[PDB]
Design an enzyme around this catalytic site. Structure first.
Site, mmCIF file in Angstrom:
data_model
loop_
_atom_site.group_PDB
_atom_site.id
_atom_site.type_symbol
_atom_site.label_atom_id
_atom_site.label_comp_id
_atom_site.label_asym_id
_atom_site.label_seq_id
_atom_site.Cartn_x
_atom_site.Cartn_y
_atom_site.Cartn_z
ATOM 1 N N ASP A 176 9.377 -71.851 -108.830
ATOM 2 C CA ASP A 176 10.074 -71.090 -108.234
ATOM 3 C C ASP A 176 9.161 -70.454 -109.068
ATOM 4 O O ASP A 176 8.031 -70.266 -110.446
ATOM 5 C CB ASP A 176 11.107 -71.136 -107.392
ATOM 6 C CG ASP A 176 10.723 -69.454 -106.549
ATOM 7 O OD1 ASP A 176 10.166 -68.345 -107.049
ATOM 8 O OD2 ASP A 176 11.352 -69.966 -105.509
ATOM 9 N N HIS A 193 12.747 -63.446 -107.193
ATOM 10 C CA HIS A 193 12.980 -64.890 -106.226
ATOM 11 C C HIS A 193 13.616 -66.209 -106.642
ATOM 12 O O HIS A 193 14.280 -66.841 -106.049
ATOM 13 C CB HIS A 193 11.382 -64.773 -106.243
ATOM 14 C CG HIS A 193 11.610 -65.897 -104.798
ATOM 15 N ND1 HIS A 193 11.263 -67.347 -104.295
ATOM 16 C CD2 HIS A 193 11.323 -65.297 -103.324
ATOM 17 C CE1 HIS A 193 10.969 -67.253 -103.896
ATOM 18 N NE2 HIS A 193 11.553 -66.434 -102.817
ATOM 19 N N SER A 242 12.149 -69.088 -97.983
ATOM 20 C CA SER A 242 12.819 -69.081 -99.457
ATOM 21 C C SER A 242 14.173 -69.544 -99.827
ATOM 22 O O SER A 242 14.834 -70.220 -100.767
ATOM 23 C CB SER A 242 11.747 -68.263 -100.097
ATOM 24 O OG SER A 242 12.223 -67.000 -100.238
#
Length: 356
Positions: free
Chosen positions: A36, A83, A289
């Site tokens: 990620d 994120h 996600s």
């Protein structure tokens, strides 16, 4: 102890309002490799979960040299986006919020700077995560590949597909399982014409071919889609018949009412999910996600509890012990632990990997 647990409708959903936590505490032998945007290691809910393995796969210059700030330093796993930290919290947060597997070890593989990624980097990350012994590998990112037919230039995306396949086969050979997010484009991945129509918005297609959502498409990968708090597939989530679903939230009310009303009337409290971010604090987010890491952490608990060494066995076990809501398999960690059944260039341009 856990000040913001009450905000975690999404975690309550998969844990039976906290029941699963009391059922099992993982050892230090299990870890999830998170592919990620990196992590904020000093986040108070996350710092005690950090493992000893990490790598930055983002090359100098980042995505096609658009990121002069990216150094290519293999030790730089700092999260510039948020994120990766948001995803990590869903796995392992152990403080003011709780992940699915609080405190479970996470190792960090950075494949984003501040924007897009590449399959070459993701494939390298998969191999590295497997080599470092992460038996569960979380990929909350993806891309659409047209693997037959042709674009205007006469080619297609099959080489990228094969590169993912090789990396995934390697991870499998090493004993790792990969868990990957379905896209957030409201596409039924089995409806090829609809996927072609979607691609035509962003690419120049000459002869339509088979479109896949990668790397979630691969048979050995666990594909994860999203549900909202009602247990319905999220408005934004892609749909796959062979997927498992977990809470990702909804944008349905955001879209109907607009940002001001969405916020002022508090829709976000139930529609979006509360997670750790790279400010050192928290943020409301949505998307597949954030369903994906719930599944990854749950699988890691199973691997540790049952000493499951065969990833093939692991996927079978998950699917057999995931109940159905409205015809869709959904994550239920209590059921899983109990194991009753024994076993212009754009974000969608060719080659662009994006966060889900």
């Amino acid at each position: 102890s856990h000040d913001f647990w009450d905000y975690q409708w999404d975690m309550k959903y998969v844990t039976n309002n906290g029941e699963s936590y009391a059922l099992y505490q993982p050892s230090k032998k299990i870890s999830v490799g998170i592919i990620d945007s990196g992590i904020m290691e000093e986040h108070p809910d996350l710092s005690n979960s950090l493992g000893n393995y990490f790598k930055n796969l983002v090359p100098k210059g980042g995505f096609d040299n658009e990121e002069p700030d990216e150094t290519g330093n293999p030790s730089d796993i700092v999260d510039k986006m948020g994120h990766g930290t948001e995803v990590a919290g869903q796995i392992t947060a152990n403080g003011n919020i709780l992940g699915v597997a609080p405190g479970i070890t996470v190792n960090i593989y950075r494949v984003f700077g501040e924007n897009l990624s590449k399959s070459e980097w993701v494939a390298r990350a998969i191999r590295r995560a497997a080599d470092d012994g992460n038996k569960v590998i979380n990929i909350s990112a993806g891309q659409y590949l047209m693997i037959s037919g042709s674009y205007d230039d006469g080619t297609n995306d099959y080489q990228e597909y094969l590169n993912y396949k090789s990396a995934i086969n390697y991870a499998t050979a090493k004993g790792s399982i990969v868990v990957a997010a379905l896209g957030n484009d409201s596409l039924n991945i089995q409806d090829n014409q609809t996927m072609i129509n979607f691609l035509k918005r962003f690419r120049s297609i000459k002869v339509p071919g088979k479109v896949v959502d990668a790397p979630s498409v691969f048979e050995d990968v666990i594909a994860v889609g999203g549900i909202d708090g009602y247990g319905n597939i999220s408005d934004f989530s892609n749909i796959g018949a062979d997927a498992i679903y977990a809470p990702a939230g909804t944008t349905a009310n955001f879209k109907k009412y607009g940002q001001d009303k969405f916020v002022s009337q508090g829709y976000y409290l139930k529609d979006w999910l509360f997670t750790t971010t790279n400010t050192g604090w928290y943020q409301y987010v949505y998307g597949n996600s954030f369903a994906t890491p719930k599944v990854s952490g749950a699988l890691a608990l199973v691997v540790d509890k049952y000493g499951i060494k065969n990833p093939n066995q692991l996927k079978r076990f998950l699917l057999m012990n995931s109940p159905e809501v409205n015809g869709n398999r959904v994550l239920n960690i209590v059921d899983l632990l109990n194991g009753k059944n024994k076993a212009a260039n754009n974000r969608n341009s060719r080659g662009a990997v994006s966060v889900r």
